[model samples]
Target: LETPGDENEHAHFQKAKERLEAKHRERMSQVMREWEEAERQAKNLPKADKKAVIQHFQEKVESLEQEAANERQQLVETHMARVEAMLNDRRRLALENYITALQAVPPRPRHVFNMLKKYVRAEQKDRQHTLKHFEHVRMVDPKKAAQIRSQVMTHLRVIYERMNQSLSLLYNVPAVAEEIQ
Candidate 1:
């Protein structure tokens, strides 16, 4: 997992697959060899019905074929498990990186104000167009429209609380602080 770039299990799996494929091929050949002898013997038998006996041999080969198919399935499942581990490796790395990423961004009052303002103003634009947005959704599902309207109200109320919390630091940016309130 620590080995991020180009350090893949691709090589390991290929030989792993080739080895399995070799077995698959060998297993198939063995079945063919057995089928030839069994079919020949069925024709030579005195009392046995030729067609029924031959069909039984065919079914016997099919059972062997099913075993080969199961090996192919097992190989694919191995590949999937390999891929699933790779995904988890990336996810763990991302989880670790987020801590490093955020620690690099020190959360002082100025940083807080700047970030919250960016989102607050972004959300406020939607808040301002409440009626226009409401009418658009209102034409369709009333429940979805209710969800949107309720969402807007929730957003604005959260924005208000956010602004109110920053009032103590209003001296930092008085004009914008007042405007927000």
Candidate 2:
């Protein structure tokens, strides 16, 4: 069954044959020695002894390096697949939430800005007009918080130019004499 010409299949078959040959060699060697000893006794000669012999066995075992490399490759592939799936699920969930929010809330737009300003003042009447007061009031009113967050999310796609203009204005502000060295 094993050919000695083609290198790839030949090597595999040869290795397999070598294993069978090695097993047969060992068994035959044991039986041949006993028969040879009996024949020597029958021939009136000293029973001859053969040297202790070891047959080379070809072991068809997977290399640890190959196995470990394969496992690492599988792990990397599995992890990347999971990460992609999670990102897709997140996008789907966000779209569903957006749709749900739209359906649940009244589509009519109210004077939310005025209402928010009043809520801010009402909640922070005693506090000074500072960033901390704004932050505190924004944190306190859940509806106003949701309104602002949703407004930002909804307008993000269209607010790039406005954002850039604001940034440019902020960057070009001249330093006051009191602030200069």
Q: Give the winner by TM-score.
A: 1
Q: Candidate 2's residue-wise lDDT over 1-181, tens digit each? A: 3224443443544465466556655655654665555455446443332221111111112233344446445544443454445434544443333223222143212322233333334323212222333354477666666557555444443334433443243243233112221
In model 2, the Cα lDDT at residue 11 comes to: 58
**CA-lDDT, candidates in order:** 0.58, 0.39
lDDT score for residue 13 of model 1: 65
TM-score of each: 0.45, 0.24
Once model 2 is optimally superposed onto the true structure by TM-score, how far is the C-alpha of residue 52 displaced, in angstroms?
23
lDDT of 1 by residue, 3-46 (tens): 33455677766766788778777877876787777667667666
lDDT for model 2, please. 0.39
